[PDB]
A paper describes a structure:
Gasdermins (GSDMs) are pore-forming proteins that play critical roles in host defence through pyroptosis. Gasdermin (GSDM) proteins consist of an N-terminal pore-forming domain (GSDM-N), a C-terminal autoinhibitory domain (GSDM-C) and an interdomain linker. Recently, GSDMB was shown to exhibit direct bactericidal activity through its pore-forming activity. Shigella, an intracellular, human-adapted enteropathogen, evades this GSDMB-mediated host defence by secreting IpaH7.8, a virulence effector that triggers ubiquitination-dependent proteasomal degradation of GSDMB4.
Although GSDMB isoforms 1, 4 and 6 formed pores similar in size and shape, those of isoform 1 showed less aggregation than those of isoforms 4 and 6, and isoform 1 pores were seen to be distributed evenly on cryo-EM grids. We thus subjected GSDMB isoform 1 to cryo-EM analysis. The GSDMB pore was found to be 24–26-fold symmetric. 3D refinement of the 24-fold symmetric pore led to a final map at 4.96 Å overall resolution whereas focus refinement improved local resolution of the globular domain to 4.48 Å, allowing us to build an atomic model of the GSDMB pore using the structure of GSDMB in the complex of GSDMB/IpaH7.8 as a starting model. The 24-fold GSDMB pore has an estimated inner diameter of 150 Å, outer diameter of 250 Å and height of 60 Å, very similar to the 27-fold GSDMA3 pore but much smaller than the 31-fold GSDMD pore. Similar to that in GSDMA3 and GSDMD, each GSDMB pore subunit comprises a globular domain (‘palm’) and two inserted β-hairpins (‘fingers’) generated from residues in extension domains 1 and 2 (ED1 and ED2, respectively) in the full-length auto-inhibited GSDMB. GSDMB pore oligomerization is mediated by both the inserted β-strands in the transmembrane region and the cytosolic globular domains. The interaction in the transmembrane region is contributed by residues running along the neighbouring β3 and β8 strands between the subunits. The interaction in the adjacent globular domains contains mostly residues from helix α3 of one subunit interacting with the region around α2 and β11 of its neighbouring subunit; and the α1 helix from one subunit juxtaposing end-on with the α1 helix from the next subunit through hydrogen-bonding and hydrophobic interactions. The cryo-EM structure of the GSDMB pore illustrates a unique interdomain linker-regulated mechanism of pore oligomerization and lipid binding.
Numbering used by the authors:
A (entry chain K), B (entry chain L), C (entry chain M), D (entry chain N): 2 to 69, 81 to 233
The structure:
């Protein structure tokens, strides 16, 4: 019934079948889910569904640290229809039938950030007395960062739908149940949907890295 | 349900029946999947499906190392339709029926790189302190390179489709299930789809080669 | 399902019923499958299907070695239709029906190379330190060359088609299966399709020849 | 399914019922199947079908050796239709039905060569160090030559057709099989189709002759 993970998963699929690319849940702090930003701990309830927290990490601007593709377009339509109905030995005619047609008018822009600039970032002196040490140590999420800025300049348009129909009969008792809920969302221009993973380890003074998509969280920081 | 491996496999087929030519999964870092670039380790789950990592290898430009066909066209249509349906002794009418018509408007360009220039490349002094040694030794993918630049200048057009229909009956219970999902992708002009294999072995100081399509990975580097 | 061997086999048939003339698989390095070029080792899986590798052999240009018919036309159509269907004692109605109509607009040009020039080529001093000795000795394909340049100046037009229809029934279970895939390829002007065989033996210093169509590979070089 | 032997056999029939006159398989080196040229060894598989090799024999031009009818026309049509069908005790209805209508627009020209000039040719001093002695002795085909130049100045037009229809039934199993393949070839102007036989014996220094149509190959040269 969520829609906002779905569009990010079309982006994910356009990358790989549930592989490298990562998705976000919502877009108040997703526009601020740019580089140098965190994620929450991961649980496996109702599929892949993790937590999220989006504070900042910039500390110093002594040396050169903040110096600065074409439009990519997705007019796609994805259809998912399915009816599962089963009758029980208690003459219960359990039923369900859903259908959803999603229209995506996804627009994507790109802001290039250098890959060796990541190493330049570890070359930065990590020191900040912002009130995040206590909660960061309490959580120990071993936060990761993003590789490159994947920006959007979109119109306000996504659509969705589902249906459901359930019947039952326990003791000559009729039961019919129907529902048709169609949804759609106004999607705003300049927001962030999909991001990457690059592990960072934080000794209390200076940090170090761990390269490839380490979302299996274990660290003694 | 992937589409981006398919078009690369039309290129592969236009080379050989699943033989020499090699395919890529996606095209954010495929435009940067030019020469001097890596691939991930290979597994055999769900057919031939490997990993990918696309960092760079250029180290020195002391001597002449960076000095610099017509349009090739594919207006093809490939059709794949199939219905597999089987009934079980439990009166289950298991069903499935899919169909996909793919329209490819593939455009290809060529940027010539000399073959003896490969030997000139091994004649280069291999020395770089970029942070890749630790992860490269951890992975030991015995990376390979590409032979010649296979470039594209394309329009934004590929199409695809599938369908599915499944029924069932366990205890006088009706179940009907249908789905029709048609997809299409906007393909951008200047990207890389298919590449080649040429094995390189890396002693810590100076490297050496291994010629023909060694994708069977074993090396003690 | 390959098309590119087929057109070369129309050329082969216009020579002889699967006899002297030889075919190639694809045309990125087929334009560079001119004289002085190699082929891969031969296996007999799925009919006559060999490997291919297309590096160069020119070493010296001390003496006269690089000094330099009308258009031949094929507007043909070849039809191949066939239905094989068999019913099993398990009431399985195994079926298959294919059809393909191929339209060839083949254009051919000729660049004359002297036949005694072959002997002049063995009179050349064979000496080259290009990195091919190691892999050539590892392979031992006892490479052959081509007799005369068979060039093309073509338009972009070949067509093809196939169909298939399979049914089955194991335990009162219906199964119907159909597929219609029509293909066509844009054929480019100046490429090479068919070539010849002339055996060469390579002692490490100077080479020698072996005349007629020795594709049965055995040599102790 | 060959067409190029057929037209030569219309020429042969216009000479005699499979008698004196001889036919060729194809026409890349048939234009160079002029006088002083060879043929391959003969085998009796699938009717009269021999091998072919077309190198040259001219050695000297010291004395007069290279000093130099109307158009003959064949607008004919030959029809060949036939259905052979047989039913087996295994209720197999083996079938076959073919038909072919061939339209020949054959054009023929004549270049006169003197018959006593043949004796003048044996009067020539036979001496040539071209690399053909080794392979000629290895083959021992006791090559023959041609009597008179039978040239053509043709348009590009021959046609052909065949059909086939096969049915079967082994165990109440239906099988129907049909095919309709019509072919046609663009025939080029100045080529050679039919030639003659005159035996030559080659002692290592000087040669000798053997007159009439000795295609029964035996010689100790």
């Amino acid at each position: 019934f969520s829609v906002f993970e779905e569009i990010t998963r079309i982006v994910v699929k356009e990358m790989d079948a549930g592989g490298d690319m990562i998705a976000v849940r919502s877009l108040v702090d997703a526009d601020r889910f740019r580089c140098f930003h965190l994620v929450g701990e991961k649980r496996t309830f109702f599929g892949c569904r993790h937590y999220t927290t989006g504070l900042t990490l910039m500390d110093i601007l002594d040396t050169d640290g903040d110096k600065w593709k074409a439009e990519f377009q997705i007019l796609d339509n994805v259809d998912s229809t399915g009816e599962l109905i089963v009758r029980l030995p208690k003459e219960i005619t359990i039923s369900g039938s859903f259908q959803g047609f999603h229209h995506q008018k996804i627009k994507i822009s790109e802001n290039r950030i250098s890959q060796q600039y990541l190493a330049t970032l570890e070359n930065r002196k990590l020191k900040r007395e912002l009130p995040f040490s206590f909660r960061s140590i309490n959580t120990r999420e071993n936060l990761y960062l993003v590789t490159e800025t994947l920006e959007t300049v979109k119109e306000e348009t996504l659509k969705s739908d589902r249906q459901y129909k359930f019947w039952s009969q326990i003791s000559q008792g009729h039961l019919s149940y129907k529902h048709k809920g169609q949804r759609e969302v106004t999607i705003p221009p300049n927001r962030v949907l999909s991001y990457r993973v690059k592990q960072l380890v934080f000794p209390n003074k200076e940090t170090m890295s761990a390269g490839l998509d380490i979302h299996f969280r274990g660290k003694t920081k």
